[PDB]
Amino acid sequence: PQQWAGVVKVNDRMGYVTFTDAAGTELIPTNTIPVTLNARMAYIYCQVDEGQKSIKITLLADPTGIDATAITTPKVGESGDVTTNAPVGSLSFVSGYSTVAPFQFSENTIVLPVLYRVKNVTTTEDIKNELAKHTFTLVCYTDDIKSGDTILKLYLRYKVEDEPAAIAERATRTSSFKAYEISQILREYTLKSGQTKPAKITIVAQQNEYNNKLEDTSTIEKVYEIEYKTAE
């Protein structure tokens, strides 16, 4: 009974939820309690049921939604823009037998692995409340897109909804995947560049390997690359 965890698209199949992996295989839950996850994208932990385009699975944990917001705005300081107030640890961590970095899920979706620092809380309610304070927004500044541009550059804007000193104290290591539907971004990129698709998407992050202080001399900028692929 092979086991697997990973990022999947969430399907609404006439009211029942199924999933689709990055290879395009539909994963059909056979759990006796219905899946009720309301997300566009998810992280699941599962096993393949015995008796082998669709595979029946048993979920081994409650599915987790991982949707995050991608926006376009013309430049820094305009409507919808977000100001970073915390550094990530990295946009990479260990998944399976290797490290994973920002990657392409489908023509419409990309995924950021985020390694970051949270407050040390212990009640289930508190942990859930703490996690909700962290928002990872990808921003495309459309004024920066010029005619012919083959590179789509996105800024990770990471905001913690807490006071500056409490942000600085966070030290508990956490990992999460964040999935971004980027069709609207791609549409705007096409209109400004005249290109049908970018050769690559770049993700620009403020990260700090040592502490959670944004204005620390250890905070660096790091650019992660995604080679953008299509069936066409």
Cβ atoms of 153 and 79 within 8 Å: the answer is no
Residue 36 as a binder of Cl ion (CB under 5 A): the answer is yes
| DSSP one-letter code for 35 | P
Q: How many residues bind Cl ion (CB under 5 A)?
A: 6
Residues 6+ apart with CB under 8 A from 83: 157, 159
Cβ atoms of 44 and 6 within 8 Å: the answer is yes
C-beta nearest to Cl ion: residue: 35
Structure tokens at 208: 């700090």
Greatest Cα pair distance, the chain, in angstroms, is 57
Nearer to Cl ion by C-beta: 98 or 123? 123
Nearer to Cl ion by C-beta: 64 or 211? 64
Taking CB under 5 A as the binding criterion, the range among 62-70, 80-88, 139-147, 163-171 that sits at the site for Cl ion is 62-70
- We find the least distance from the C-beta atom of residue 129 to Cl ion, in angstroms, to be 12
Rounded Cα distance between 75 and 67, Å, is 24
Cα dihedral 178, 157, 100, 67 in deg (nearest 10): 10
Helix (H) or strand (E) holding 27: strand 26-29
Residue 127 as a binder of Cl ion (CB under 5 A): the answer is no
- We find the least distance from the C-beta atom of residue 225 to Cl ion, in angstroms, to be 7
Nearer to Cl ion by C-beta: 213 or 222? 222
- Exposure class string for 177-199: b at 16+ Cβ within 10 A, else e: bbbbbbeebbeebeebbebebbe
Taking CB under 5 A as the binding criterion, the range among 31-39, 65-73, 103-111, 154-162 that sits at the site for Cl ion is 31-39
Residue 124 as a binder of Cl ion (CB under 5 A): the answer is yes
Residue whose tokens read 């459309």 = 142
Taking CB under 5 A as the binding criterion, the range among 30-38, 46-54, 105-113, 135-143 that sits at the site for Cl ion is 30-38
- We find the least distance from the C-beta atom of residue 17 to Cl ion, in angstroms, to be 7
Residue 35 as a binder of Cl ion (CB under 5 A): the answer is yes
- We find the least distance from the C-beta atom of residue 223 to Cl ion, in angstroms, to be 7
Nearer to Cl ion by C-beta: 37 or 101? 37
Residue 123 as a binder of Cl ion (CB under 5 A): the answer is yes
Taking CB under 5 A as the binding criterion, the range among 1-9, 29-37, 79-87, 158-166 that sits at the site for Cl ion is 29-37
What one-letter code names the amino acid at 229? Answer: K
Interface positions with Cl ion (CB under 5 A): 35-37, 63, 123-124
